[PDB]
Design a protein that fits this description.
Length: 70
């Protein structure tokens, strides 16, 4: 049949206690980290970009539109 209801995608292990819902999936409070700084995006939150989980800080630095804008 099936094993577990909500398991982490990062590592895979089953989450017990705190389940971080993101990218339409369950993850751990330590697994779900940024893709540029690997910062826990459980409480601080995350930002979906280019199919990657980033933190306001980074995401902002990346998305940051060039300084030269006509
Ligand atoms: Zn995990
Ligand atoms: Zn980051």
């Amino acid at each position: 049949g099936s094993s577990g209801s909500s398991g982490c995608h990062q590592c895979g292990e089953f989450i017990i206690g705190r389940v971080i819902k993101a990218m339409n999936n369950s993850w751990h409070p330590e697994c779900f980290r940024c893709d540029l700084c690997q910062e826990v995006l459980a409480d601080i939150g995350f930002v979906k970009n280019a199919g990657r989980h980033l933190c306001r800080p980074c995401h902002n630095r990346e998305k940051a539109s060039g300084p030269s804008s006509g």
